[PDB]
Structure to design on (1956 residues):
């Protein structure tokens, strides 16, 4: 293995698991074993819960500004170790260094930095009732919460969940994806160095069916935040509900539509469509995988997509010049290739790509070529289902109302976007699109201030923005009676 | 039957169900059959959903002030028909006319009135990112939502759920308890009379395991709001989750503590304790069923409680002089008597009542005497478990920290309260009590402005207050890019 | 006269002034004496203040919903009396019935309705400091406030000031313009009929130099809200400050620019330009009196403006078909004609109008033709100074940056607007314009929800929207210390 | 002189004034000339304005987080240089090192730190009107603003004014008191070193009647924030209004009441009263200079006050053991002694002090002993007027309503406090006190989160808290019309 054995992080240090079992994390670019990683047992979950209960008390007893300063110190460390953490994320995920060095830690720390400054701004309400009575609310910490991460942006997701949870005075137990456990453990080390109390951010490694479920079932955990697939999310939310009625945030899957209107800058439109499909090798939840183009512009648009796709630099993600890496794992590659074969079988027209890249060293990795299908139909499997790989589906439409109806005809509702130069059309279309994250003349930017999450089966709750901080607190209403009390008895 | 057969309410009128099945609603005061009530079929659920989808479009298309005026008109009608509706609620629930004429419709309409005024104040945010880009958010309706009511405050709970739903621009399908279906239908008529579009408030009658379940499973319903038992709430929330990842509000059970500190005026304390236990014959979710009294004041406190409980006027709820009616049903009375016998068996000292009242006409109704146990212990079944009847448990303590520790030692967290004249003690204690609804020197008041709901296994989300209106909307973030777009490809 | 003598309104009824002085209000269409009106003495101001102090206590002692219901009742009465008040406003101001029946009371009551619904939403904050201390704020009424009205929209201005004042729990003494006293007295009757307590809205008639000044100087008045000219506003605000440091709102003059970009539909641009200059005969503070047109569009634009100006229906404001009435007075007309003559003297090109209309019965009124100058230059008097009459100045520009710079080159900053179909240009340009009220592809609409007021010398503070209700309260911060107190002594 | 000639700070560096004139700043402990300081000319004011205009554009063009990080860097430097700055403040003000090292920079920096984290939280609103139109607001910087500081807390006031002004994207020109000009110049160096762009914080030294007036009259400055006496504030606010209608914040004088209720612990009451009168040698605007005690507890309270006053450690402010220093200046000392003599002449009973201290080296300084008058009456000059020195007035009352009425009977309204252990009375009494800053069972703490400012003639607007940041922005409302535009012409 490249690295030493990775252990559980509980109480400000690494501790041995008690399962007697490990799993391997693999580098998807070459099949190299990166590390053996311990599996947390049911007793380890209990241990992390008790540690979080005690640690949360220390954390909540500090002043708001003391918490703020500690989180700001964590941000400073993250900025300092940006390139080091980026190199690790690239090993674990296969995403290009060009991406990890500029996105993953940058934007994860951006959100932690944002919430760090807001700790003193967490306030309740005061409501007078009459001269002799008034109400005030408190926004108290939930206590111990759990985060369950996904494998596409491991440390970014860890930061986006832990930052508001910790800013709101909670302790979080975090379970990274079995596929990508490494950077989450580094984050825990950084929080401790920054001054976060022992127990406040603990990390348990292992599978979802076990460790994830033990967390979602635990009676002392007050909230679960999960990022991953919709089918899995339903199961997680159900377990969280039936066990102890936990509060939930779910950031799930999508089949987001990008509508290119006839008055769009077509070069901007093609830049947007390729960014919305092939960044992180197509493994982004918000990807615009159904691209709607007017019939009159189909040929011109295909030419523009083809030109951009042909110059994608697929390669070793450790090369600075690479902008397109392998997929995260060999099993994920198999799944994506299955969807590609489905697309061919249902007679979608293959424009670009469509197979595994095996030339030379690439045969050692999980590389799928950027793939574009056109002449697509709404009932096709590649159009209806999330592939979570580099596969764009181009759909022809004839009128604006039709495009919007078709865009909305899905159980998903994560993101949506339009490309048009018209003031009226831009806002009117976007207001009609049923998605939580809406982009006009752009795609993919997710500022710390902007709440993001899904409509419909794409999610519950939100992340980022002021609203998310409020949602990691629970409301206590206090009525103060200053006058008489009348009983009817 | 006292009244004609009750039909479903869909699309601004009554329609025939398609189940070919009915159930009865019984007057718990005298066992009389009040009405046959139709059971909705799965197809009737589909019918109600399609009606709601279309009606919601009409409703949302109006201006905010147009919706507000219509809701304010519904309020005016509710005030005008307060006594008539109260008469009906008393028949269906057995609650005293002195309660139904003063509380049920009064406080239900108060919440509708509150939200009616806030329709034009529902706003999103705007955030500048840079000269060339900004974000704005929209708070959009969820669309079609479903409310599932409880039997203790039928029309009030219908109003507390439907008011913020409609004010936020949604359509609601409401399922009242099988035990108490009558007033929800009247509310539906009133909304139509007020100018609410057909389909915006539909009412389906039937069972929780049938009609309730079909609503929680329906993929076009975006949110479920349920009030009822904690064990039932878990199944409901899990169903809502597993099916289509619906947003959820849960207002569930409690075993709420009332702590009487030694400096308290015992007359006020006794008044609060009695009000917190025997109002609506103890059928109130927020009731202060665990009463903590200091060892030095147990005797004096018990005397003041007995004094008050003795003059409780149990009787015909049709009598204005009555302040304590029968329970809502015979099976519930059976449940309550079961707990009372458990109290006796487990060595709790019986101070008041503890028997079914069967003299004269009371034998034909479901009357349980106001019951007080004392010398209780935390391990007793009557202390640990929600009874949802007129059974007060008095517990002795020795010091403040012990009292608060014991108050918090439950899986519940709905309400909590303290009685003390000391400024420091009042706020300090209340801040440590783990409940969503906290009262100082009072009990039971639930102003429209005050968000109410449970900590822990007592709930998810809140009702009333500004925050609840917010939670019947979904956030859409719109990023407007005014400048160039850079692609890495 | 047309009506009987109008007296002061103090304490829920009309009372005799103690000045022994009266003035006449005249119908500007025909010179008819409408009424003798009493002038408040210094003694009467004192009487109004004492009445307001006592009334404010009664009003503030009610619950929020009680105040809401009373303000909602006043709205109902205003809707009922809409046509009658419009008729009165038309007599007093000379504005066409077509305008007063659809704008003045409608939009005035719209704001009162808005704030009526918001009364229960006025809340303070709660901020925890540590375990042993927390802060809550109260948003308390200021107490007695004064509003000083303008003559162009008499009752709408009375409503826009009094509505948030009363909603926030204050009493207001209102001084309508000496030119237009009639509708303010009717509003006072209406508030009383709706249930507003005696003293909460008192009306004193008379001059700005006497009565207005005595209110602005009075030490028991806590806030002054003034609408009128910038020159006068400076003096009012200075007097409010030097007397007793009152809070202030000032809605003043403007020379607002309208920029028509070359991609604008010119029919729409001309419609906007004409509406922004000739509604209420050009007597609107927010009018777009500097109209910027690109050189390439100048000729076509002038032709389209000319077409519309030619079919403007000047005439008797009593005739429902009139859409352009006389000015408010002969001295005001003389001022406007002076500006028109300056325009001619300074070589601006006269496109339309430019003189008094005297034909037949029009000689008995103060009628000025809708006037358009073109080929204007930035240093012309008509371009630099507010005319407050029906005079449009059209200015040619060559590039976007130039237009925006010239638009901003004024001491005024009330409104600004752009007409363009381009998404990026619409927002980019508007973000750069230095005005409080900005319109894209429209002009003149002022929703109750939308805060309005001036940048620079056009205003201090805002009217309408949530923010304005807040500014009719004063913040009290309350720190509750629950723990020990440490002294250095 | 102890130090070199002090210059103006404009554009990120020191520059020579163009007046040809200087003034001296004197150490009040010993009369030593600390430095000659340049007087700014009218042309220097113009230079600072032009510098601020350009600097503000650079500052506002950064992202919110870029501004946040720079202000956070300034906080870090202030923390590093706390003791250094404290020592200079002690020289310039005479305040004890024990105070300046623990309060002045600590709490000034606390507010800068608070606002630094809030920069990304400044948001506008979004309001839908109908399908075809919506409004968004922007909170834009005012531009260039000016702050005029007072002499009692020179660097803290410079920070409390500049922090929200800079955080909101403005440049500020700051004019410290002529009495204490030294630390404001150091703050300017620190902002520059932290990365604040040249011109964003400029410092001009000189008199109030000259430099202060030239700033208040300048047409390019959009807001004035002034801290000082009420009499002076009226003139400053009037000049700001009459010149160009500037926005204003005024933090002015007080005669704040402290009410000690008869259930209060007299030791705690005495600690509060002494802290509320003698901290910073009585030179605090919010001081509780009118102390109300129940008639029956006057004797006992006087003895506890006398006990603590006798042990107050008056001395050299450079001695760490000193907790009470000389007054800020010899002319201020003379004013204070004049008030003391008025107290004697009006036959208030002198309990402690009441003389200048001249023993030994104290004779070279401006030392006035801690002074306590009792048997005071409401019509005495010392009770009516702000002394701004170490002079406590003790007043006997008989009932709560009387105490409150008397507490409120003043033109001032800055602060107020009550001492009581009773829950009801604490909140009831504090709700009735007409002051913006209210303390329960404490005095003097002013957390960054807590808005502070005066009712009545003690202020306009607020400092600190979320609300203050909002008041360093101006609201722009943008209405976007997406549909048709209708003209009446
Ligand atoms: K891996
Ligand atoms: K980017
Ligand atoms: K959902
Ligand atoms: K029943
Ligand atoms: K009640
Ligand atoms: K819960
Ligand atoms: K008139
Ligand atoms: K209109
Ligand atoms: K201004
Ligand atoms: K000095
Ligand atoms: K302190
Ligand atoms: K004031």
């Amino acid at each position: 293995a490249r690295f030493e054995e990775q252990k559980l992080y509980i109480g400000g240090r690494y501790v041995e698991a008690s399962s007697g079992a490990t799993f391997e994390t693999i580098n998807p670019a070459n099949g190299e074993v990166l590390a053996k990683v311990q599996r947390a047992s049911r007793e380890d979950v209990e241990r992390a819960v008790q540690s979080a209960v005690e640690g949360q008390k220390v954390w909540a007893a500090m002043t708001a500004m003391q918490r703020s300063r500690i989180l700001r110190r964590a941000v400073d460390i993250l900025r300092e170790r940006n390139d080091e953490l980026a190199a690790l994320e690239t090993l674990d995920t296969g995403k290009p260094l060009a991406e990890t060095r500029s996105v993953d830690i940058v934007t994860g720390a951006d959100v932690l930095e944002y919430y760090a400054g807001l700790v003193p701004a967490i306030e309740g309400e005061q409501i007078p009732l009459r001269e002799t009575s008034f109400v005030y609310t408190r926004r108290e910490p939930l206590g111990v919460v759990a985060g369950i991460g996904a494998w596409n942006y491991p440390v970014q997701i860890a930061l986006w969940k832990s930052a508001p949870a910790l800013a709101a005075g909670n302790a979080m137990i975090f379970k990274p994806s079995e596929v990508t456990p490494l950077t989450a453990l580094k984050l825990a080390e950084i929080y401790t160095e920054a001054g976060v109390p022992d127990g406040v951010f603990n990390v348990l490694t292992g599978s979802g069916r076990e460790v994830g479920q033990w967390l979602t079932e635990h009676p002392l955990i007050e909230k679960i935040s999960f990022t991953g697939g919709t089918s899995t999310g339903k199961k997680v939310m159900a377990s969280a509900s039936s066990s102890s009625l936990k509060e939930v945030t779910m950031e799930l899957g999508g089949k987001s539509p990008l509508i290119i209107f006839p008055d769009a800058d077509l070069d901007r439109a093609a830049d947007i469509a390729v960014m919305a499909n092939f960044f992180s090798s197509g493994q982004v939840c918000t990807n615009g995988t159904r691209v709607f183009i007017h019939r009159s512009q189909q040929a011109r648009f295909e030419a523009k997509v083809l030109e951009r796709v042909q110059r994608i630099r697929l390669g070793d993600p450790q090369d600075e010049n690479t902008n397109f890496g392998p997929l995260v794992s060999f099993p994920h590659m198999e799944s994506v290739l299955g969807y590609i074969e489905s697309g061919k079988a249902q007679k979608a027209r293959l424009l670009c790509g469509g197979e595994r890249v095996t030339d030379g060293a690439f045969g050692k990795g999980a590389y799928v070529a950027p793939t574009v299908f056109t002449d697509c139909r709404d009932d096709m499997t590649i159009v209806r289902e999330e592939i979570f790989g580099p596969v764009m589906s181009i759909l022809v439409y004839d009128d604006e109302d039709e495009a919007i109806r078709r865009a909305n005809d899905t159980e998903y509702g994560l993101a949506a976007g339009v490309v048009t130069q018209d003031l009226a059309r831009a806002h009117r279309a976007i207001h009609r699109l049923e998605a939580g994250i809406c982009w006009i003349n752009t795609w993919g930017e997710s500022p710390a201030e902007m709440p993001v999450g899904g409509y419909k089966q794409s999610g519950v709750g939100r992340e980022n923005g002021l609203t998310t901080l409020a949602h990691y607190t629970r409301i206590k209403s206090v009525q103060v009676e200053l006058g008489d009390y009348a009983s009817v008895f």
Remarks:
- Residues 450 and 465 of chain C are 5 Å apart (CA to CA).
- Chain C touches chain D through 82 residues (CB under 8 Å).
- Residues A 456, 460; B 245-247 surround potassium ion (ligand 3) (CB under 6 Å).
